[PDB]
Amino acid sequence: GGTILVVTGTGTGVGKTVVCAALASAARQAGIDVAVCKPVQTGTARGDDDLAEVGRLAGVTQLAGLARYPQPMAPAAAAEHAGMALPARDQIVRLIADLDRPGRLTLVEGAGGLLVELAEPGVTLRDVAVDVAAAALVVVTADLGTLNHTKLTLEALAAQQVSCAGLVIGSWPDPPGLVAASNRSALARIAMVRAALPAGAASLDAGDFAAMSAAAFDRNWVAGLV
Amino acid sequence: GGTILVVTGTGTGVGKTVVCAALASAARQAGIDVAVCKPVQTGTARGDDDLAEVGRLAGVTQLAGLARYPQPMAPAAAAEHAGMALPARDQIVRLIADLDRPGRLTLVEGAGGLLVELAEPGVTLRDVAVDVAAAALVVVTADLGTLNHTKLTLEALAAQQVSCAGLVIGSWPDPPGLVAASNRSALARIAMVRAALPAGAASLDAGDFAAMSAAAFDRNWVAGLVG
Ligand SMILES: O=C(O)Cc1ccc(C[C@@H]2CCC[C@H]2CC(=O)O)cc1
Ligand SMILES: O=C(O)Cc1ccc(C[C@H]2CCC[C@@H]2CC(=O)O)cc1
């Protein structure tokens, strides 16, 4: 096959989706074919559609999903509220494996943090990454507390031999500030910081977002992904 | 010795200090001698003093500090900003060991989350807990995101065989929305929820705080903490 990368985060609302779009965009601009799988989407009642975000920000067309829940909650809580089960582990893993092909960078977005239940029973994006032999890109914030959450997430990855492909700071403030500046240096000593997306990047149009994305990542690392 | 509990949290600003005071208050009301220690305190330049707040809220007089740093940041960054060094591992252990005595509950309040560096090189409250044979009480929020952070924290505890003394929800909203309610039920399936402090607990005066504290915990769990 090709390269499967799961795009996780230290938590919820840390920029997972915008990073997935940024990497997608930078990889497409490197001539890499990109697909994104988001097996479970919640929050559809209020308009949440992370696949469409990547579609519009990055131009990706291979956008694979299995389930959509109206409530802006955890997949398990959203599915409980809807009275309908989450998808099965086999559906997620097989969808990703069917998406994966030579020459292609396939990004996998879960929901919230790394140990969030995505499929029955208590299957997580970590289990899925083990099953498809994917490495994990970990999206982190620049804010107070990001170091503990990052170290916690990287331990959980290594505790299951899920390789860490690096960190991305989901939102980099202007101008940084003492905590943000200190955190960025401390994060680099924990793992490779592959990018720090400027704050506000999620609101960019497709051309501006592509420009930002190409500049945010190191071309050689992107091109080395596949 | 007695019982040493480290009081940690899923992150920063989740209620560790108020939980430390609430459990100290509850233990003191059951006649248990309580000492609270804060190995590393930052933010002294804006008046942060968790030992002083624990003393204010719970009446604890046996309060032991060690390292203090002005800036309200992580210990490593706050020490580097002040031109100072982090304490060594053995200094934190000595701080705690000197407090430990039979019949006494010694609470060790961390700074930030569990894997925060408290001593060079990369020594965390988890290591300290191994060193002094302490279990860890994990303070959590009820907010969206708490389940992942709680499971991450508990996994990190088990990875070094640090027993989890249970969870405490540091602020419980009244009434709870769907997410808060769903989270409390899910949290109780991953570990014992020892208490759920009512929102605004940090503002209660001494009497109300002591009453809140006595209600928040199961008297038999508190009284069983130390013989
Ligand atoms: O995890 C990191 O980013 C590193 C890290 C972030 C924050 C803290 C403690 C904060 C700092 C000032 C106030 C205190 C409140 C608290 O005790 O949580 C320690 C380490
Ligand atoms: O960990 C918990 O407490 C449970 C939990 C919490 C939040 C999510 C993600 C979703 C939920 C809605 C917006 C968010 C969008 C996103 O962050 O991708 C998943 C599991």
What is the per-residue DSSP string for A167-212? EEEEEE-SS--HHHHHHHHHHHHHS-EEEEEETTGGG--HHHHHHH
Q: Is A39 annotated as a binding residue?
A: yes
b vs e for A183-205, b when ≥16 Cβ sit within 10 Å of the residue's Cβ?
bbebbeebbebbbbbebebbebe
Please give the radius of gyration of chain B, using alpha carbons only, rounded to the nearest integer. 16
C-beta separation of A101 from A37 below 8 A: no
Q: Which of A20, A22, A18 is nearest to A7 (CA)?
A: A20
Q: What value, to the nearest 5°, has the Cα angle with vertex A11 and ends B165 and B168? A: 25
Contact list, B147 vs chain A (CB under 8 Å): 74, 115-116
Q: Is the CB of B186 under 6 A from ligand 2?
A: no
Distance from CA of B118 to the nearest CA of A (A): 12
Q: DSSP letter string over A37-54? A: E--EE--GGGT--HHHHH
Alpha carbon A173 to its chain centroid, in Å, reads: 20
Q: Is the CB of B185 under 6 A from ligand 2?
A: no
CA distances to A45, B39, B42, B57, B162 from B45, rounded to whole Å, are 45, 17, 8, 21, 33
| Closest C-alpha residue for ligand 1 atom 6 | A145
Dist. CA B124–CA A117, nearest whole Å: 28
C-beta separation of B161 from B135 below 8 A: no
Dist. CA A187–CA A146, nearest whole Å: 8
A166, with CB counted inside 10 A (0-12, 13-18, 19+), is middle
Q: Which of B221, B206, B219 is nearest to B30 (CA)?
A: B219
Q: Which of B28, B34, B38, B57 is catalytic?
A: B38
Partner B, chain A 17-46, Cβ-Cβ below 8 Å: none
Handedness of CA B92, B95, B99, B100 (dihedral sign): positive
Dist. CA B143–CA A110, nearest whole Å: 19
Contact list, B178 vs chain A (CB under 8 Å): 71, 73, 77, 81
Percent of residues in chain B assigned helix, strand, coil, to nearest 5: 45, 25, 30
Using the structure block, give the residue that is written with the tokens 């000197």.
B98
C-beta separation of A3 from A32 below 8 A: no
A62 interface with B at CB cutoff 8 Å: no
Contact list, B152 vs chain A (CB under 8 Å): 113-115, 149, 152-153, 155-156
CA dihedral B62→B66→B71→B75, nearest 10 degrees, is: -120
AA letter at A84: M
Resolution reading in Å: 2.0
**Which pair of tokens denotes residue A56?**
């519009």
AA letter at B34: V
Q: What is the CATH number of domain B1-227?
A: 3.40.50.300
CA distances to A90, B112, B159, B198 from B84, rounded to whole Å, are 54, 19, 31, 38
Q: Which of B108, B131, B152, B82 is nearest to B7 (CA)?
A: B108
Residue B106, classed as helix, strand or coil, is strand
Identify the DSSP state of B46: G
C-beta separation of A20 from A7 below 8 A: yes
Q: Which of A9, A14, A60 is nearest to A37 (CA)?
A: A60
Q: Which atom of ligand 1 is nearest to the CA of B116?
A: 20
**Which pair of tokens denotes residue A177?**
């500030």
Q: A95 CA to middle of ligand 1, Å?
A: 40
Q: DSSP letter string over A116-137? A: -EEEBTTEEHHHHHHHTT-EEE
Dist. CA A164–CA A154, nearest whole Å: 7
**Which pair of tokens denotes residue B56?**
């204010």
- The partner residue sitting opposite B149, judged by closest CB among A147, A149, A155, is A149
Q: Please say if B38 is a catalytic residue.
A: yes
C-beta separation of A194 from A223 below 8 A: no
A158 interface with B at CB cutoff 8 Å: no
C-beta separation of B123 from B130 below 8 A: no
Dist. CA A137–CA B115, nearest whole Å: 20
Q: Which of B179, B180, B193, B186 is nearest to B221 (CA)?
A: B193
Domain A1-226, CATH number (from 3.30.70.260, 3.90.1150.10, 1.10.357.10, 3.40.50.300): 3.40.50.300
